[PDB]
Amino acid sequence: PNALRFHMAAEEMEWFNNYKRSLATYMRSLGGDEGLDITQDMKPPKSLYIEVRCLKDYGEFEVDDGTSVLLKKNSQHFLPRWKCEQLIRQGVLEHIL
Amino acid sequence: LTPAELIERLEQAWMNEKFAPELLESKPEIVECVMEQLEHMEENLRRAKREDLKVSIHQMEMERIRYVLSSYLRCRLMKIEKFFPHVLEKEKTRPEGEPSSLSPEELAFAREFMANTESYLKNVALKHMPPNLQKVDLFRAVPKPDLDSYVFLRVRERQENILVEPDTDEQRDYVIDLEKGSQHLIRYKTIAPLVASGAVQLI
Amino acid sequence: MDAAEVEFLAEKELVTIIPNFSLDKIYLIGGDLGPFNPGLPVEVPLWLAINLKQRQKCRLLPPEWMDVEKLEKMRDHERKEETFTPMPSPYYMELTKLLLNHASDNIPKADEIRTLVKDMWDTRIAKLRVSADSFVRQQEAHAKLDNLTLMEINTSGTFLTQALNHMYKLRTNLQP
Amino acid sequence: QSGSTPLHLTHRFMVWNSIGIIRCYNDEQDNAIDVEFHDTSIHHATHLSNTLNYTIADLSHEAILLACESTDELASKLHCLHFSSWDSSKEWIIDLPQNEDIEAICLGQGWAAAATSALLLRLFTIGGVQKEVFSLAGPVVSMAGHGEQLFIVYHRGTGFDGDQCLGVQLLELGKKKKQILHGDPLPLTRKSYLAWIGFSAEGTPCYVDSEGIVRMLNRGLGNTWTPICNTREHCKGKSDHYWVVGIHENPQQLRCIPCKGSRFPPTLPRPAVAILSFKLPYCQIATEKGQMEEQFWRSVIFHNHLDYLAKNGYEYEESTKNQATKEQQELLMKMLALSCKLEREFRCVELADLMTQNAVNLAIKYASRSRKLILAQKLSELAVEK
Amino acid sequence: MFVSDFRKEFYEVVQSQRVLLFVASDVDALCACKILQALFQCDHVQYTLVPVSGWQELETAFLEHKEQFHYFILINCGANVDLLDILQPDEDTIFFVCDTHRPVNVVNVYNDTQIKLLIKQDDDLEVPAYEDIFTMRRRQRREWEARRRDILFDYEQYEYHGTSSAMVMFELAWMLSKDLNDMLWWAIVGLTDQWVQDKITQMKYVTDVGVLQRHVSRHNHRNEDEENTLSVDCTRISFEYDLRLVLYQHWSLHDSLCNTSYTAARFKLWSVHGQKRLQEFLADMGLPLKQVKQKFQAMDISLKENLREMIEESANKFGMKDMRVQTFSIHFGFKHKFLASDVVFATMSLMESPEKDGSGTDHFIQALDSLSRSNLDKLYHGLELAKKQLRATQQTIASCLCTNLVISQGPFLYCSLMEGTPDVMLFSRPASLSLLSKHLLKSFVCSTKNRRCKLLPLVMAAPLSMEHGTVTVVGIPPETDSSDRKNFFGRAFEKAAESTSSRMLHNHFDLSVIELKAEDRSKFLDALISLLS
């Protein structure tokens, strides 16, 4: 977020971008085609689907191909766990129950 | 060989990597085989209809496997980033026939990290220093893995005449034997060949 | 290692269920399961058994060690012995929580069983406290642990090894 | 009623079969009947207030059948709840004449039967058309129905010194109507009484006595009664009993509930079904010879249903018959090879008599390759004879 | 169209597809919603839940999601309007309607392709036939047109309510063979709300309690012997013939008698002479005043065990013939016990909370969450809100009577609140305002001796927004015990407003509550008085 980039020096931004490029290269090479994003599955899995509540007015969110849902505040959805996981970490959604 | 045993070997490597205070030796065979298993099973579920019960059971199995693989790889990457000059120099020194601690992709990542970090420090502060102080040695500045750490373990094969050294006065040295299926608390430095050989498990 | 990960390991233990439907034999990476027939028992791992129970698709049967008569004798023997006694399952605590939360409707005398298992946890933890203190007072160098489970190790273990690292460093320092 | 537990119990099983379970609750909370299906997809669980005080019940794929005795005011009533109908009015009730009480009931494919204290048997369609009435030879004991088959057991006379005197009547209610067993005597273990009666899922009549001896109708042997299991071998204590729920010829399974200290289980905690294997009481069964004989004849008996289905025009996967025949040939071949190596070459020809022509050709090749040429010659004579 | 088979027609059609839920805000809708979520979660159905409080929000929400979903579900709204005309859907969007309001709009009855009503066939419906709506030829056509107007005016005459939506949802749960013990409680809470808000006649309520009482017995016996209670970890639902007082187990006996609407009216407790009458009642029972002022949980156990008989006997002697009611209660753990009504007042108070603690949806969210056993602390919080709500209501009624605000206009009684006076903010919303007005009318009719006053409807007005210059207006049917709960103020307000050319807006789902500009109120009242005549 731009609010947080305000504190970094120019050379620090250079370092951060180099690190992202290299790390993304490693993950893409792990195996199969286009590898494995190891920055996910941070907790051991209990179920396929979870119920999530939106904390902020946010734009359109794409679920599969042309299908999308609108993240208006206090709307509530039932979705597969692996699509929601990063938005929960950043603070957009809440895992209820 | 059979898939059940392959999964068991992955889950063994996971726990050894958690508690050992160094970067243990690499396992390229396991990673390649587990990855192709996931690719194959994905295509098999893709070809069938998605409404059925057994399909959901298969998907749950895949999530449990993928979590262990991801967790294991994240931990190895922490240890590479933390001790970069030491793992690089050790691999540069390695004699023929002994296994490497790094897979080729891990080594590539390590080399990139080393170059990037040195460049940042040189550009931000060291070029402005007096001419006699513009060089620094990261091999000296970065700490080393602490092999005297204490660990819990469980033994899978019997072992005999293991020497324990309290303090470091020879008058207190003594030996013990590790019976099948027992559990012990001891310094990592004494048992390090047993972990590499597969005689014991860290718990 | 967190309690969540220790539980993740405990979920591999096998349990018996009675299905209320029918399905063929299914092949998994970890093994072959089934066939499933209505009203007849089959063995499955605990992560699958809990999931089918939640979705109203089966009935759980208590493991043969979950019995008041058996657990009373085990508690008394544990209190009497000077060391750690061997246990009915390596993951007794985790299995107790999962089954009694979801499957109380199928397991008789559940609220008796909770108290009996709680007593064993209370005894064994006390023994571990005494052992840690004795390890440091006597400046010992090695110890043996034949009947501790992984949850019990993981609860208190990190503190002990962290303290022993520092102590070993203090006593050696006069001879670099 | 077969597969039920005694009346004096406030909580009891009215019927437990391979379809489901019917419970009777006569409690201060509620006097009601509860119906449950083993396969949840069949129909949803159903609860009925037992105001009429039904005492006898039955369950099929098609309907639930309930019955009560007369009181000083009520007729004995027959209540049918035909859930499988495509029409909407899915129940009916029939009231019996005065002083006539229902004594046993059973369900079959599209029809129902009830035996009464008039020593009469009444028949009904599943939708409650009255079908034809006839008279019984003596006081009925129990009944069972499967497809077009009606299986009845009754008191045949006065038994003595602990023996019950029981007779069996078996009818086929197809387009052509036939009587198979004409009130014939029913075999029993000495001083026993009848414990369970029914059919295999494959539609063979079967029954069990109080000594835990399972007997099945041997259609391959002139409709005689062959024992196929003795549960007392698995009565690890003498107070053990096996309360039978159902029989399957393919897979070979006896489905029963183990009961310790009682001949039957309590309603709660819910008992769990145990599976037992079938075992004909053959002699010298420690020998591989006796084992192969027992396996062979056990296989033969369980495949009788395919022949019965064929006689009735009903179909089955013929690969089952081919496989069973092949297993039987392999068992005969192993017994023949064993007999040959025992030099009981006469016994080899006796076994080959039971083989198919192709199996006799293979036996000729085996005997020739074993260089038992007299045996190969005798087997060739048999092959020429067939 | 009316759906004929819930399992085949509704459930198996939607089970394949993505669905969007529109939900009204009352306890009946909340319970029906909870049941439906729990069925969807077993079968891994994906859904989205959107709450709405009136027509503006519903129209806006539909326009936002029109392209994304083809299957919509509406809980407690839409049965009494032309959905196709108002919403303007595409050719193949499908709507499932589940709603207690009556009468059903004839367009929804005779659409055969796109509007599907989950309304139960056995409710009290009677409808005109299709052909009655849809040179000599001119004379014949004019006569038929006159007949159309004639029959439609008889049809549109009154509002009323059908079977609770929560009970309709519970039938689907049983036939799918998935009826957990929780769903039986949500069905019970949903039915009790219609009785507390007085939307159904007494006879229907007793009948429906008779229906749910059987399922309680089935669910107990499903796994139950007589050796012991299965566990104190478990929960149980029981039928109870209990006292009417609100909410007597969570505060003192004296507080309940002061704050219950019925006894407060009967003893006239806004007057100091009424307090003397109350003391005479307690003296007849022989309850020490120290016991009566203590919390019910801390009363002497010797008195607690026999209280209901004492109160009924004394009440019967005093002429209060109706102190007992048929109801249910739930018990779990060692010390959690609630009557079916305590849950209703707690949930209602959480939902209609007066404080502007952010957007109104936040209150809705808290109300919905509190219905699960894992969120029990919220239920205990909601009870504390309810206590304050009841007290505010009673002192408002006393102020209204003593200041003599209730005035006869002839064919109806008229009353209005004014700014700054006690607790007026709490009565700004239609839910709280309508319930207050009902209690006020009961108090007035029990108070007065004038026979011509005791059989009248009442019209009440309250400040909505003084910066918009707006007032909310509500009308109540006449108060009698055996009334059918049918009321005529919908068409009366519409005709009077149109004849007046009033600046007004119709927004809430009930047709008896509207919004008016303040300056128009005089001529609008004149039109109503002259129209009712």
Swiss-Prot record, chain B:
Region spans: Important for GINS complex assembly: 146-203
Protein name: DNA replication complex GINS protein SLD5
Oligomeric form and interacting partners: Component of the GINS complex which is a heterotetramer of GINS1, GINS2, GINS3 and GINS4. Forms a stable subcomplex with GINS1. GINS complex interacts with DNA primase in vitro. Component of the CMG helicase complex, a hexameric ring of related MCM2-7 subunits stabilized by CDC45 and the tetrameric GINS complex.
Domain of life: Eukaryota
Record-level GO BP terms: DNA-templated DNA replication; double-strand break repair via break-induced replication; inner cell mass cell proliferation
Alphabetical list of CDD domains matching this protein: GINS_A_Sld5, GINS_B_Sld5
Keywords recorded for this protein, A-Z: Acetylation, Chromosome, Cytoplasm, DNA replication, Nucleus, Phosphoprotein
Major place of residence: nucleus
Source organism per UniProt: Homo sapiens (Human)
Keyword presence, Ubl conjugation: no
Protein family according to the UniProt entry: Belongs to the GINS4/SLD5 family.
Function: Required for correct functioning of the GINS complex, a complex that plays an essential role in the initiation of DNA replication, and progression of DNA replication forks. GINS complex is a core component of CDC45-MCM-GINS (CMG) helicase, the molecular machine that unwinds template DNA during replication, and around which the replisome is built.
Triggers of expression: Significantly up-regulated in aggressive melanomas.
GO cellular component: CMG complex; cytoplasm; GINS complex; nucleoplasm; nucleus
Subcellular location: Nucleus; Chromosome; Cytoplasm
SUPFAM superfamilies per record: GINS helical bundle-like (SSF158573), PriA/YqbF domain (SSF160059)
From Swiss-Prot, chain C:
UniProt organism field: Homo sapiens (Human)
Binding partners and assembly: Component of the GINS complex which is a heterotetramer of GINS1, GINS2, GINS3 and GINS4. Forms a stable subcomplex with GINS3. GINS complex interacts with DNA primase in vitro. Component of the CMG helicase complex, a hexameric ring of related MCM2-7 subunits stabilized by CDC45 and the tetrameric GINS complex.
Keyword Phosphoprotein: yes
Name of the protein in its database record: DNA replication complex GINS protein PSF2
Protein purpose: Required for correct functioning of the GINS complex, a complex that plays an essential role in the initiation of DNA replication, and progression of DNA replication forks. GINS complex is a core component of CDC45-MCM-GINS (CMG) helicase, the molecular machine that unwinds template DNA during replication, and around which the replisome is built.
The UniProt record lists the keyword Cell membrane: no
GO cellular component: CMG complex; GINS complex; nucleoplasm; nucleus
Family that this chain belongs to: Belongs to the GINS2/PSF2 family.
UniProtKB/Swiss-Prot annotation, chain D:
Subcellular location: Nucleus, Nucleoplasm
Coiled coil region boundaries: none
Annotated positions of the N6-acetyllysine modification: 238
Taxonomy, superkingdom: Eukaryota
Function: Core replisome component that acts as a replication initiation factor. Binds directly to the CMG complex and functions as a hub to recruit additional proteins to the replication fork.
Assembly and oligomerization: Trimer. Interacts with the polymerase alpha catalytic subunit POLA1. Interacts with MCM10. Interacts with DNA2. Interacts with CDC45 and GINS2 subunit of GINS complex; these interactions associate WDHD1 with the CMG helicase complex.
Protein's name in the database: WD repeat and HMG-box DNA-binding protein 1
Source organism (scientific name): Homo sapiens (Human)
Organism lineage: Eukaryota, Metazoa, Chordata, Craniata, Vertebrata
Gene name of the encoded protein: WDHD1
Swiss-Prot record, chain E:
GO biological process: DNA replication checkpoint signaling; DNA replication initiation; double-strand break repair via break-induced replication; mitotic DNA replication preinitiation complex assembly
Source taxon at top rank: Eukaryota
UniProtKB keywords: Cell cycle, Chromosome, Disease variant, DNA replication, Dwarfism, Nucleus, Phosphoprotein
Residues modified to Phosphotyrosine: 130
Expressed in which tissues: Widely expressed, highest levels are found in adult testis and thymus and in fetal liver.
Iron-sulfur among keywords: no
GO cellular component: centrosome; ciliary basal body; CMG complex; DNA replication preinitiation complex; nucleoplasm; nucleus
Effect of mutating residue 430 to L: In MGORS7; likely pathogenic
Name of one Pfam family that matches: CDC45
Subcellular location: Nucleus; Chromosome
Family: Belongs to the CDC45 family.
Disease: Meier-Gorlin syndrome 7: A form of Meier-Gorlin syndrome, a syndrome characterized by bilateral microtia, aplasia/hypoplasia of the patellae, and severe intrauterine and postnatal growth retardation with short stature and poor weight gain. Additional clinical findings include anomalies of cranial sutures, microcephaly, apparently low-set and simple ears, microstomia, full lips, highly arched or cleft palate, micrognathia, genitourinary tract anomalies, and various skeletal anomalies.
Subunit structure: Component of the CMG helicase complex, a hexameric ring of related MCM2-7 subunits stabilized by CDC45 and the tetrameric GINS complex. Associated with ORC2. Interacts with HELB.
Gene source species: Homo sapiens (Human)
